[PDB]
Amino acid sequence: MNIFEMLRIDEGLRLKIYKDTEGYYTIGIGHLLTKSPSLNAAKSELDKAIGRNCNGVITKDEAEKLFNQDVDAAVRGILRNAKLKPVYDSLDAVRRCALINMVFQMGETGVAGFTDSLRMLQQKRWDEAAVNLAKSRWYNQTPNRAKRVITTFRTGTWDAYK
Numbered sequence: 001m002n003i004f005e006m007l008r009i010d011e012g013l014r015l016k017i018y019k020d021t022e023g024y025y026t027i028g029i030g031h032l033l034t035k036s037p038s039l040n041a042a043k044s045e046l047d048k049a050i051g052r053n054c055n056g057v058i059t060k061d062e063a064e065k066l067f068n069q070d071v072d073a074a075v076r077g078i079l080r081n082a083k084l085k086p087v088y089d090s091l092d093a094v095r096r097c098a099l100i101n102m103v104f105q106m107g108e109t110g111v112a113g114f115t116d117s118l119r120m121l122q123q124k125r126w127d128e129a130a131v132n133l134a135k136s137r138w139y140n141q142t143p144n145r146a147k148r149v150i151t152t153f154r155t156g157t158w159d160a161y162k
C-alpha cells in the first residue's frame with residue numbers, strides 16, 4: 001500500500017464535476033476546484049487547470065495528472081511548514097502517509113491547527129493522539145475516513161485500509 005492507493009480509496013475517482021462532502025465543486029481524485037457556488041466558475045477553473053476546454057469532464061489520465069500534482073504539493077508543503085516538518089521528520093514511513101492524507105484533505109493550515117495532536121505524535125504517544133484527533137469537526141463530519149487515518153497513526157500499519 002502506498003500514499004496514492006490510500007488516497008484513491010479515501011477520495012474515489014470521478015471524471016465529471018461533482019460536489020464534495022462540503023458541497024464544493026471538485027473533480028478527479030479529491031481535486032477541489034472552487035469554493036464558489038457557481039458551476040460556471042467551476043468549469044472555468046477546471047479548464048484553467050487542464051489547459052483545455054473540458055466542458056466539466058476529464059479523462060483518467062488528466063485526473064491522475066492532477067493527482068500527482070496535488071500529492072507532490074502536499075508533501076512539499078509539509079516540508080516547508082515550520083510546524084509540520086518536525087513532526088513529519090520524526091515519524092516512520094506509514095505514519096508519514098497518514099499526515100500526508102490529512103494535509104491533502106484539510107490543507108496545511110488546517111492540520112497545523114491540531115497543536116496538541118501534533119505534539120503527541122512527535123512524542124510517539126499513539127493512543128493519546130488518536131483520542132485527541134477524534135475531538136474535531138473533521139472526525140464528526142467524515143467519521144469513516146477519519147477513523148481510518150486515526151487507526152493508521154495509532155497502529156503504524158495499513159490495516160484499516162486492508
Ligand SMILES: [Cl-]
Pocket residue numbers: 134135136137
Ligand atoms: Cl469535538
Ligand SMILES: [Cl-]
Pocket residue numbers: 141142143144145146
Ligand atoms: Cl467518511
